[PDB]
């Protein structure tokens, strides 16, 4: 049974925060995976991307652990990407699913040409890098699909992007760096100032300040 | 792997302070490896080995 | 090297004859057959074994 150990967990468990977007708006870190299970939960879906054996030399042979790269997310929503390394592959997969739940970001989705209906693509051209792998996303017309390699395609489909042109330079064969670069490119959708986000920000209370009187009862 | 995990979860649920299950042999292939399915505390040396840890 | 062994295993193999079975299916009815095998009336069963032609 969940017993929350942070102020944010005590607020989420007691129904005091009504969405994940409040926790995103006030930029707060998430330290418990059951917050993501509380909000998204039954709509989240994960895929293990790679199980990678790594080997430390000792004087008695080689010591072997297994890293697992787990992508996760809600189609139309959010995406995570976690890497855990352990002595057992099931333990690595479970720790990687926890780590992929905790690194869940929101993706901003825009339109290619005319603004009719719901968003479908990236808002602008965003890039993302991880150690000599660049990934660039380009906005695409309604219905072209993700035009990309198979490994960023899982992350872009889990994000809820329906169509996108892509390009990758670098040693994309190292799958962890290629996963960790398209995740970086779809993180920069919500930190790019387009001219509709030029309105002056109207501030509201932090969750820690709004519920400072319920948080002393516990 | 699954058959040792079932026994280990039973004998950790039943309140033992720790256990250790080892299956040695050629469980797959022709060279014979071992396993080490361990959990909790486990004392190896001294005299309390006689009455606290139960081996078979 | 020595050319004397050539077609050693090809001529050494015990000659088993092919067993007569029915004419398979062809074309659109074959595609219907393999759609009916995989998609409609897929079995609620031991999933993740999704390896048709699984021996054991």
């Amino acid at each position: 049974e969940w017993m929350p150990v942070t102020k944010l967990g005590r607020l989420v468990k007691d129904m005091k925060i009504k969405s994940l977007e409040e926790i995103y708006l006030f930029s707060l870190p998430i330290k418990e995976s059951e917050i993501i299970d509380f909000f998204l939960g039954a709509s989240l879906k994960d895929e293990v991307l790679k199980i990678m054996p790594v080997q430390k030399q000792t004087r008695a042979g080689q010591r072997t652990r297994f890293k697992a790269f787990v992508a996760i997310g809600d189609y139309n929503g959010h995406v995570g990407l976690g890497v855990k390394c352990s002595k057992e592959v099931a333990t690595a997969i479970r720790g990687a699913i926890i780590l992929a739940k905790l690194s869940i970001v929101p993706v901003r989705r825009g339109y290619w040409g005319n603004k009719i209906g719901k968003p479908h693509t990236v808002p602008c051209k965003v890039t993302g890098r991880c150690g000599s792998v660049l990934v660039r996303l380009i906005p695409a017309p309604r219905g072209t699909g993700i035009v990309s390699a198979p490994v960023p395609k899982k992350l872009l489909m889990m994000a809820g992007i329906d169509d996108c042109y892509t390009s990758a330079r670098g040693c994309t064969a190292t799958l962890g760096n290629f996963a960790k670069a398209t995740f970086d490119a779809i993180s920069k959708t919500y930190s790019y100032l387009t001219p509709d986000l030029w309105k002056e920000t109207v501030f509201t209370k932090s969750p820690y300040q709004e519920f400072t009187d319920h948080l002393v009862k516990t | 792997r699954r058959a040792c995990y079932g026994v280990l979860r039973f004998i950790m649920e039943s309140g033992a302070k720790g256990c250790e299950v080892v299956v040695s042999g050629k469980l797959r292939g022709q060279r014979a490896k071992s396993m080490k399915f361990v959990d909790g505390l486990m004392i190896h040396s001294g005299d309390p080995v006689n009455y606290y840890v139960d081996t078979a | 090297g020595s050319l004397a062994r050539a077609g050693k295993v090809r001529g050494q193999t015990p000659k088993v004859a092919k067993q007569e079975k029915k004419k398979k299916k062809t074309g659109r009815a074959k595609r219907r057959m393999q759609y009916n095998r995989r998609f409609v009336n897929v079995v609620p069963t031991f999933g993740k074994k999704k390896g048709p032609n699984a021996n054991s």
Binding site: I51 | - | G47, K48
Partner: peptide, 29 residues
């Protein structure tokens, strides 16, 4: 068990096959 057969035979000649089988078990349909 694909977990055990991968954790044992990831080093042998049968590594590619047991990785194929482990991804089949994990991903699934």
């Amino acid at each position: 068990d694909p977990y055990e057969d991968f954790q044992e035979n990831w080093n042998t000649k049968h590594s590619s096959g047991v990785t194929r089988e482990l991804m089949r078990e994990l991903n699934g349909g």
